[PDB]
Amino acid sequence: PFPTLSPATIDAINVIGQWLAQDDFSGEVPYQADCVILAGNAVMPTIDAACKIARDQQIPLLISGGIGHSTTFLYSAIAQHPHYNTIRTTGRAEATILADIAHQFWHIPHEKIWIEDQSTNCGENARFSIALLNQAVERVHTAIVVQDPTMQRRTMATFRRMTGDNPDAPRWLSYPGFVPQLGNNADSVIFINQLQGLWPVERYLSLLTGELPRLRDDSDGYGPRGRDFIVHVDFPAEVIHAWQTLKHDAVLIEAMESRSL
């Protein structure tokens, strides 16, 4: 089992988790939109959040994802799901599989599901979703973007690199579905969110820690001073402290490097 961690380290992980999940830019604008965009991922609570909104608001659901890094995770996440195991996986694009959940299980009509099944990474999820939105029949002014909580911040900064946005009137709203939180229990670390289908802690920590150098606006990052894939990200001082706390935690490094991430 994944080892127990110091309270300081738990706190730090939770600070960075919160920041990656919670979009500051759009603050707390109500989630009333013209379309919901589900970026390809494997986190079933997130995927269900997208379907639930499109269902409840009776708006179009645009599902974006072809084949890339998260595809085989999605395949596994379907196969272990107590209801969605009936959906065929191997060899299909992400968005095709996710449309089966939307239609077969959430009863969203075909005419309300738009499938973008060719993107191979975050930049293409966003670029290709924008391309499809720009072809719109009924013009889209506001869209809710639903992504794995660890990659939410990157994804919103990718969309915003492409179109810009207005802080007084955000066109891109952010709803990963939940704010991931860890805690110690019985000689191990567990999620405190009472949700099925979450990453193994080791995988969540690999993702969470993989995002930070991408977000960091230096020559090695995805920002304007690096690859120029995303807008400049300003790191809060609390997040920097949290990231240093992780980098200095020997128990944590040992756990993360001796295991499957």
From Swiss-Prot:
<dbReference type="InterPro" id="IPR003848">
    <property type="entry name" value="DUF218"/>
</dbReference>
<dbReference type="Pfam" id="PF02698">
    <property type="entry name" value="DUF218"/>
</dbReference>
<comment type="function">
    <text>Binds S-adenosyl-L-methionine (AdoMet).</text>
</comment>
<dbReference type="InterPro" id="IPR014729">
    <property type="entry name" value="Rossmann-like_a/b/a_fold"/>
</dbReference>
<comment type="similarity">
    <text>To S.coelicolor SCO4629.</text>
</comment>
<dbReference type="GO" id="GO:0005886">
    <property type="term" value="C:plasma membrane"/>
</dbReference>
<protein>
    <recommendedName>
        <fullName>Protein YdcF</fullName>
    </recommendedName>
</protein>
<comment type="subunit">
    <text>Monomer.</text>
</comment>
<dbReference type="InterPro" id="IPR051599">
    <property type="entry name" value="Cell_Envelope_Assoc"/>
</dbReference>
